[PDB]
Amino acid sequence: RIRDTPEDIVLEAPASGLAFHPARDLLAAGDVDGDVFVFSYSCQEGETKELWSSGHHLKACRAVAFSEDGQKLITVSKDKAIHVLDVEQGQLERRVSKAHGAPINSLLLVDENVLATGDDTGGIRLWDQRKEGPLMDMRQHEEYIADMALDPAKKLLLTASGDGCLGIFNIKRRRFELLSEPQSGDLTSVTLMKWGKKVACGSSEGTIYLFNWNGFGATSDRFALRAESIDCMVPVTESLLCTGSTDGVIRAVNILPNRVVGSVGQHTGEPVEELALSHCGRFLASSGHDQRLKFWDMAQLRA
């Protein structure tokens, strides 16, 4: 009998890296040991299987992303390397060792050639797969790069840091633009909302900060959740996003009107590490310190 969502995936180690394939029912995870798994998921009971694993990283895999063409999975690690794996069978195509001088925490694919990486000391690098060495090396942030987001127009890279600042970098000019005023909370998460008009940042105090597009110096608005922290966010619509917190609860949050819509689900009393949205829009995945990937029905929520 086929369910509304795929069954839970049980892991041997908790995963901070999580991403959905842009055209196939595949979910990638990277774990605290450094291993990388790709799972073929299905709403049919018992039909969700491990497709492949890759154990090439030497330390914790902090982030993973599928290329837009669906052929590659790019991964970054505490081992200070970037990996490029083939989606067919997880074969390592490329390892860039000592890509940063510190552990890498964040990864964003700009286009088929260009990507950004963020490290635990706040360093940003931009890469082109066609060119040896970084396009840009920018160290204005003072603390870890938690998360990054991309201008729809692909001109600006937005960074959320533990230093409490939103960072702005110009990809095309290869330069630093500005750091926001620092917030009291560490900025754990950054996502574009309202057709690219608003930047929403989650904080270590359980606050969502809003910035206006091209008003990046200071917040235009803010509101608190009834949660000690927000540690991950993913947009579901132009007005709805989902948050994960250290209390293990996944919340649906509306933006302007700023309102918590409800709890989507929980990893009972275990921190939520990361969220991702299926290429079809139907499923939210959450990765928890309970060592589970859980799938949530977004059709229910989108109404």
Write the layout of secondary structure elements.
Blueprint: E1 9-10, E2 15-20, E3 26-31, E4 36-40, E5 49-54, E6 61-66, E7 72-77, E8 82-86, E9 92-96, E10 104-109, E11 114-119, E12 124-128, E13 136-138, E14 145-150, E15 156-161, E16 166-170, E17 175-179, E18 187-193, E19 198-203, E20 207-212, E21 221-224, E22 232-235, E23 240-244, E24 249-254, E25 259-266, E26 272-277, E27 283-288, E28 292-297, H1 298-301
Antiparallel strand pairs: 1-28, 2-3, 3-4, 4-5, 6-7, 7-8, 8-9, 10-11, 11-12, 12-13, 14-15, 15-16, 16-17, 18-19, 19-20, 20-21, 22-23, 23-24, 24-25, 26-27, 27-28
Main location: nucleus
Keywords: Cytoplasm, Nucleus, Phosphoprotein, Repeat, rRNA processing, WD repeat
GO cellular component, one term: nucleolus
How would you briefly describe this protein structure?
The protein is an all-beta fold and 303 residues long.
Explain the overall architecture.
It comes from Homo sapiens (Human). Its main location: nucleus. WD repeats lie at residues 10-49, 56-95, 99-137, 140-179, 182-221, 224-263, 267-303. Nucleolar protein that acts as a modulator of rRNA synthesis. Plays a central role during organogenesis. This is WD repeat-containing protein 55. This protein is mainly beta and 303 residues long. It is built from one helix and 28 strands. The strands form seven sheets. The protein has a four-stranded antiparallel sheet. Strands 2-3-4-5 form a four-stranded antiparallel sheet, with no helix packed on it. It has a four-stranded antiparallel sheet with strand order 6-7-8-9, with no helix packed on it. The longest helix has 4 residues, at 298-301.
